[PDB]
Design a protein around this nucleic acid. Structure first.
Length: 44
DNA sequence: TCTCCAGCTGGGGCTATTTAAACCATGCATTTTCCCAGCTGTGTTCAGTGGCGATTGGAGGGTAGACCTGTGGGCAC
């Protein structure tokens, strides 16, 4: 959960693009919602 | 004869050379200093997260109530 802060929104956006997350979530670009979604996707 | 004048007849001041001394003017060139700009470092603030605490929800256990079955007693043939 920690290194997900160092993701520093922009690289987390690129990671969500890499996993295949739909563009709406990426579009929101939440600093907290984005990291929760990428933690969920890395759990999936 | 004496005075004046007027030309002219032989006489003095330019030029050329070397040298040192101390001096000057007129933009020029160089060196120094001051100022401004940029880059780096440190400090502060903000916000993420960690972490912990509290509240809510779910599950399990216990107690209470109700229903069903069994036994006993009373009554009737």
């Amino acid at each position: 959960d920690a290194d997900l802060r160092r993701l520093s929104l922009k690289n987390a956006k690129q990671l969500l693009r890499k996993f295949g997350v739909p563009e709406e979530e990426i579009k929101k670009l939440s600093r907290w919602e984005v990291i929760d979604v990428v933690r969920t996707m890395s759990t999936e």
